């Protein structure tokens, strides 16, 4: 089915022809348009008072990256390199070797935050919930180099944001 | 060895097209130096034009020559209509590039590239 958006024949009776004459000379349809912007003047605006008020987000939000630990404090990351393989932007760089004990752990874990597209494939790919995108979106920097995160920066992010991150995973993991 | 031609049936027709393009470029250099306000001289512009024609002087395939002339004409139309900017016109001169050595010993010291 279709409909016509603009296929009208206007009435030619005297009343309709005078109603259009008054509209042309008295600008009635232009005054009607003033009424609508007047009605907005007296509405409450939609502005929020940033940074005192914040735009609503959900637990799924994809923000700054972090590397997480188990409750014991051991790193979750096992240097499987699945996040590095799936990264659409090739933003992750990883090196690994046996730790001083026998553990399989990374020696390099970099994210070029200026290559990253914040797509979240890395946290989907991770089998142990080690790499996540956190809820933080207020980390703009004065230099480019400050956005090339090494493993120390990402572990600090996890230690900094774990309290919020764990609660967000708790809200969403049954959808995953 | 029977193939579909582009513009020239043989190398003598192709060289006629090459000479014509050289004239158009030769006439244009004085205008290009003026419009784009280049700090090179007209001789430098014409020397560069000559240099670009001589790097291809060994072609013997009229279809290859036809394409180089085709590309050379698009290159010229970009310049005349000022679709190019000063940066594009000056890319032919590689001003910021340091001279790479050509002798063996100089290559040997810097690195491994042949």
């Amino acid at each position: 089915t279709y409909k016509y958006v603009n296929l009208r024949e206007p009435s030619m009776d005297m009343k309709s022809v005078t109603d259009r004459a008054a509209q042309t000379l008295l600008w009635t349809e232009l005054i009607r348009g003033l009424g609508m912007t007047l009605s907005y003047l007296f509405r409450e605006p939609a502005t929020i008072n940033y940074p005192f008020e914040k735009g609503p987000l959900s637990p799924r939000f994809r923000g700054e990256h972090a590397l997480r630990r188990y409750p014991s404090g051991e790193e979750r990351c096992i240097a499987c390199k699945l996040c590095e393989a799936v990264c659409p932007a090739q933003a992750i760089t990883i090196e690994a070797e046996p730790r001083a004990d026998g553990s399989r752990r990374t020696t390099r874990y970099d994210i070029d935050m200026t290559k990253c597209i914040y797509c979240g494939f890395c946290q989907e790919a991770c089998p142990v919930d080690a790499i996540v995108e956190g809820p933080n979106f207020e980390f703009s920097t004065e230099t480019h180099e400050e956005l090339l995160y090494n493993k120390e920066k990402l572990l600090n992010n996890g230690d900094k944001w774990e309290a919020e991150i764990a609660a967000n995973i708790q809200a969403d993991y049954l959808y995953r | 060895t029977s193939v579909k031609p582009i513009f020239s049936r043989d190398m003598n027709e192709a060289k006629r097209r090459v000479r014509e393009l050289y004239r158009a470029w030769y006439r244009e250099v004085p205008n290009t130096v003026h419009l784009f306000q280049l700090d090179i001289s007209v001789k430098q512009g014409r020397d560069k034009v000559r240099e670009m024609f001589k790097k291809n002087a060994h072609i013997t395939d009229p279809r290859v020559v036809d394409l180089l002339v085709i590309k050379g004409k698009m290159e010229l139309e970009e310049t005349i209509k000022v679709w190019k900017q000063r940066t594009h016109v000056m890319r032919f001169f590689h001003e910021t590039e340091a001279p790479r050595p050509k002798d063996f010993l100089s290559k040997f010291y810097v690195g491994h590239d042949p």
């Binding site: 630990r69 409750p71 404090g73 090196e95 020696t107 390099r108 874990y109 207020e138 980390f139 703009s140 920097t141 004065e142 230099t143 180099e145 400050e146 090339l148 995160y149 090494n150 493993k151 120390e152 920066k153 230690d159 900094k160 774990e162 309290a163 919020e164 764990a166 609660a167 | -």
Partner: protein
């Protein structure tokens, strides 16, 4: 968090920190791996 407090971990920061960009305590990137090739060290005595 008053009604639903977060889960306490030993490794979680006790003191939150704001954005430190542009300050002496900003983040500076570096390579976290060790040297990969060891260079030979010549003997410290003469013998030639």
């Amino acid at each position: 968090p008053t009604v639903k407090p977060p889960t306490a971990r030993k490794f979680i920061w006790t003191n939150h920190k704001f954005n430190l960009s542009g300050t002496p305590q900003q983040y500076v990137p570096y390579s976290t791996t060790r040297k990969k090739i060891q260079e030979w060290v010549p003997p410290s005595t003469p013998y030639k």
